[PDB]
C-alpha cells in the first residue's frame, strides 16, 4: 500500500515545485499514473486478504474504493481546472493540495486495519472537504453548508470514538482481523444497545440516513465541482464501508436493532425520490438521488445478507461513478449559464449533441438500465430485501418508478424541448469536459463487462 | 580537700561506667513493615514497540 501512498504524498511537492504553466499537466499525469499503480490491488488469486503491513491491508471491499479514489483524483483535477483560471497561482496550488490530501487520506482510510486509525483518518478527511466547500464555494450559504456538514459528522463521530475506545478496552487491540476471529456474542442489554447505536450512528450520519440527511443537499449544492464529486462518490461510501467493518462485532442485537433504520431507509428513499420529482435545483436533485441510493445501501447493510452486501458494494461503486458524472454534466451547464435552475436551460440537445449523449447515458445509468452495475446492485439489494420480508417489494417498486420518473424528467427538461435562444453565451464544448464525461462513462462500461471485481466480501 | 571546678569543666560530656544493660528497644517499637519486593533483571526493550493503538513502533 506504501507504493501507492508514497507517490501520492510526493504529488504535493510536485504541485508546489512545478511551474505555474505546468502544474495542472504534471499533477494530472502523475495522478493518472497513481491510479494505474493502484490497479495492482486487483491481483487477488487466492481467498486470502492482501495484508501488506501491520497497519495496511487490502480487501475485496476496500480495493474498489481505493481504485475509485485514485481514479477520481485526476478527474477532479480536470473538472476543477476551469473555474480556477481567473485565480491566483498559490491558491490554485493550495486547491490541488487539498484534493491530493483528500485522496491520500481516503486511500489510507480504506486501507486501514485498525478502527482508531480509521476514525483518525475519517476526521482527517473531514477537514479538507470543509476547507474546499467553505473557501471555493460560490453562494453565501456555503458557510452554513460547511457548518451543517462538519457538525452533523462530528456529533455522529464522537460516540463512535467512545464506542471504539470501549471495545478496545474490552478486547485489547481493536484490530479488524482479531475482532473478526475472536468476536463475542453480546448479551443484548441496554448498555449493548447504546454501544450499538454509538458505533453505528456516525456511519449512518455520513451515509446519510433519512431525517439526518439535511447536511447533504446544501453541502453538495454549495460545494465546488471537485468537492461534490469527492463527497458523492467517496465519502458516503466511506460511511457504508465503516458500517460493514463495524457490523461484524454487533451480533446478535443488530437483528432487532436494524428495524428503525430499514424503515427510515425505505420511506426516505421514497420521500427523496419524490423531492427529486419536485425539485427546482439540478444539484439538489442529484443530491437527493444520492440520498435515495445510499438509503438502499443502508437497508442492504442492515439486513446483512450476502446478496445484500454484494449489491451494496456494486451500488456503492456504480453510484459513485454515475453521481460524479451527473455532477460534472451539471457543472458544465453551470459554467455555461451561471445558474443551477432546473428549468432555465431547456433545449440543450440542439446545441450540445455529444453532451446530450453523455447526459442520456448518465441518466440511464442512474435509473439502472441493464446490464449495468447500477441495476446489478439495485436488483440484488431488492432480492435480499424481499428475502428479508416479501412486503418490501412495494416500497422498492415505488422507488424504482419514481427513480425512472425523475431521471427522465431531468433529461426532458434539460435536453429536450425548444431551445432557450436567449442564451447567447453557449460555448460549443470543451475537450476537457468531454474527456471528463468519457472518463466517467468508460469505467462503468468496463465494470458492466466484468462485474466480478466489485462483488465484495461475500462473493 | 575539695577543689572548685574551673570554667568549662562541669559542662563537658563525660563517659560513665555502669553495669545496667543497654535497652535494645527504648521506644518500644513494633516490627517495621518490610519494603516492596524490588524487581531486578536486565532492561529488555519494549515488546512490539510502544503498543499504543495502531503504532507499530
Ligand atoms: C448523531 C446522533 C447523536 C445522538 C445519538 C448518539 C447515540 C445515542 C445512543 C448512545 C448513547 C450516547 C453515546 C454514548 C457513547 C458510548 C456508548 C457506550 O459505550 O455504551 C455502553 C455504555 C455502558 O458502559 P458499559 O458497556 O461498560 O456498561 C457496564 C455494563 N455491566 C456493568 C453490566 C458490565 O453506555 C454509556 O456509558 C452511555 C452513557 C451516555 C450518557 C451521555 C449521553 C449524552 C447525550 C448523547 C447524545 C448527544 C448528542 C445529540 C444531542 C442532540 C442533538 C439533536
Ligand atoms: C425512527 C423510527 C423509530 C421507530 C421505528 C418503529 C419501532 C421500532 C422498535 C424496535 O426497535 O424494536 C426492536 C426491539 C424490540 O425489543 P427486543 O427485541 O425484545 O429487545 C429487548 C430490549 N432489551 O426494541 C428494542 O430493543 C428497544 C430499543 C430499540 C431502539 C431502536 C432505535 C430508536 C431510535 C434511535 C434513533
Swiss-Prot record, chain A:
Record-annotated membrane-spanning stretches: 23-43, 60-80, 90-110, 113-133, 147-167, 194-214, 224-244, 257-277, 284-303, 308-330, 350-370, 392-412, 434-454
Membrane topology note: Multi-pass membrane protein
Gene Ontology cellular component annotations, sorted alphabetically: mitochondrial inner membrane; mitochondrion; respiratory chain complex I
InterPro entries: NADH4_N, NADH_Q_OxRdtase_chainM/4, NADH_UbQ_OxRdtase, ND/Mrp_TM
GO molecular function: NADH dehydrogenase (ubiquinone) activity
EC number in record: 7.1.1.2
Keywords, in A-Z order: Electron transport, Membrane, Mitochondrion, Mitochondrion inner membrane, NAD, Respiratory chain, Translocase, Transmembrane, Transmembrane helix, Transport, Ubiquinone
One Pfam family in the UniProt entry: Oxidored_q5_N
Top-rank taxon, per record: Eukaryota
Keyword Calcium: no
Biological process, per Gene Ontology: aerobic respiration; cerebellum development; in utero embryonic development; mitochondrial electron transport, NADH to ubiquinone; mitochondrial respiratory chain complex I assembly; proton motive force-driven mitochondrial ATP synthesis; response to ethanol; response to hypoxia
Keyword Transmembrane belongs to the record: yes
Catalytic activity reported: a ubiquinone + NADH + 5 H(+)(in) = a ubiquinol + NAD(+) + 4 H(+)(out)
Subcellular location(s) per record: Mitochondrion inner membrane
EC top class, as a word: translocase
Role, per record: Core subunit of the mitochondrial membrane respiratory chain NADH dehydrogenase (Complex I) which catalyzes electron transfer from NADH through the respiratory chain, using ubiquinone as an electron acceptor. Essential for the catalytic activity and assembly of complex I.
Family (UniProt): Belongs to the complex I subunit 4 family.
Quaternary organization: Core subunit of respiratory chain NADH dehydrogenase (Complex I) which is composed of 45 different subunits.
Protein name: NADH-ubiquinone oxidoreductase chain 4
Species for this entry: Mus musculus
Gene (UniProt): Mtnd4
Curated annotation (Swiss-Prot), chain B:
Domain of life: Eukaryota
Location relative to the cell: Mitochondrion inner membrane; Mitochondrion intermembrane space; Mitochondrion
Domain note: Contains four C-X9-C motifs that are predicted to form a helix-coil-helix structure, permitting the formation of intramolecular disulfide bonds.
Subunit structure: Complex I is composed of 45 different subunits.
Family to which this protein belongs: Belongs to the complex I NDUFA8 subunit family.
Function text: Accessory subunit of the mitochondrial membrane respiratory chain NADH dehydrogenase (Complex I), that is believed not to be involved in catalysis. Complex I functions in the transfer of electrons from NADH to the respiratory chain. The immediate electron acceptor for the enzyme is believed to be ubiquinone.
Protein name: NADH dehydrogenase [ubiquinone] 1 alpha subcomplex subunit 8
Organism annotation: Mus musculus (Mouse)
High-level lineage: Eukaryota, Metazoa, Chordata, Craniata, Vertebrata
The encoding gene: Ndufa8
Amino acid at each position: 500500500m506504501l507504493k501507492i501512498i508514497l507517490p501520492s504524498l510526493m504529488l504535493l511537492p510536485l504541485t508546489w515545485l512545478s511551474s505555474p504553466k505546468k502544474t495542472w499537466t504534471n499533477v494530472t499525469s502523475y495522478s493518472f499514473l497513481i491510479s494505474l499503480t493502484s490497479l495492482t490491488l486487483l491481483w487477488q488469486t487466492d481467498e486470502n486478504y492482501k495484508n501488506f503491513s501491520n497497519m495496511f491491508s487490502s480487501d475485496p471491499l476496500s480495493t474498489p474504493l481505493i481504485i475509485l479514489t485514485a481514479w477520481l483524483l485526476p478527474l477532479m483535477l480536470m473538472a476543477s481546472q476551469n473555474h480556477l483560471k481567473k485565480d491566483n497561482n498559490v491558491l490554485q496550488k493550495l486547491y490541488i493540495s487539498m484534493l491530493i490530501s483528500l485522496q491520500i487520506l481516503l486511500i489510507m482510510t480504506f486501507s486501514a486495519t485498525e478502527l482508531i486509525m480509521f476514525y483518525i483518518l475519517f476526521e482527517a478527511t473531514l477537514i479538507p472537504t470543509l476547507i474546499i466547500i467553505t473557501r471555493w464555494g460560490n453562494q453565501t450559504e456555503r458557510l452554513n453548508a460547511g457548518i451543517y456538514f462538519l457538525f452533523y459528522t462530528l456529533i455522529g463521530s464522537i460516540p463512535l470514538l467512545i464506542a471504539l475506545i470501549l471495545i478496545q478496552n474490552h478486547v485489547g487491540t481493536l484490530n479488524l482481523m482479531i475482532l473478526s476471529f475472536t468476536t463475542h456474542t453480546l448479551d443484548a442489554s441496554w448498555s449493548n444497545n447504546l454501544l450499538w447505536l454509538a458505533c453505528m450512528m456516525a456511519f449512518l450520519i455520513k451515509m446519510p440516513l433519512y431525517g439526518v440527511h439535511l447536511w447533504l443537499p446544501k453541502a453538495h449544492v454549495e460545494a465546488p465541482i471537485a468537492g461534490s464529486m469527492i463527497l458523492a462518490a467517496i465519502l458516503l461510501k466511506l460511511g457504508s464501508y465503516g458500517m460493514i467493518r463495524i457490523s461484524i462485532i454487533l451480533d446478535p442485537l443488530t437483528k432487532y436493532m436494524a428495524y428503525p433504520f430499514i424503515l427510515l431507509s425505505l420511506w426516505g428513499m421514497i420521500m427523496t425520490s419524490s423531492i427529486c420529482l419536485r425539485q427546482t435545483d439540478l444539484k439538489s436533485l442529484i443530491a437527493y438521488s444520492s440520498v435515495s441510493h445510499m438509503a438502499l445501501v443502508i437497508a442492504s447493510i442492515m439486513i446483512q445478507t450476502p446478496w445484500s452486501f454484494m449489491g451494496a458494494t456494486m451500488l456503492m461503486i456504480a453510484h459513485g461513478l454515475t453521481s460524479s458524472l451527473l455532477f460534472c454534466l451539471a457543472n458544465s451547464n453551470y459554467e455555461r449559464i451561471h445558474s443551477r435552475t432546473m428549468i432555465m436551460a431547456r433545449g440543450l440537445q440542439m446545441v450540445f449533441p455529444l453532451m446530450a449523449t453523455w447526459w442520456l447515458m448518465a441518466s440511464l445509468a442512474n435509473l439502472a438500465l441493464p446490464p449495468s452495475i447500477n441495476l446489478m446492485g439495485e436488483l440484488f439489494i431488492t432480492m435480499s430485501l424481499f428475502s428479508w420480508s416479501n412486503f418490501t417489494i412495494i416500497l422498492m417498486g415505488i422507488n424504482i418508478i419514481i427513480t425512472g420518473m425523475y431521471s427522465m424528467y431531468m433529461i426532458i427538461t434539460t435536453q429536450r424541448g425548444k431551445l432557450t435562444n436567449h442564451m447567447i453565451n453557449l460555448q460549443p464544448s470543451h475537450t476537457r469536459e468531454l474527456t471528463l464525461m468519457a472518463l466517467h462513462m468508460i469505467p462503468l462500461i468496463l465494470l458492466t463487462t466484468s462485474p466480478k471485481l466489485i462483488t465484495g466480501l461475500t462473493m | 580537700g575539695w577543689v572548685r571546678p574551673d570554667l568549662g569543666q562541669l559542662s563537658k560530656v563525660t563517659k560513665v561506667k555502669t553495669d545496667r544493660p543497654l535497652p535494645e528497644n527504648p521506644y518500644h517499637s513494633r516490627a517495621r513493615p518490610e519494603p516492596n519486593p524490588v524487581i531486578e533483571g536486565d532492561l529488555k526493550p519494549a515488546k512490539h514497540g510502544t503498543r499504543f493503538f495502531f503504532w507499530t513502533v
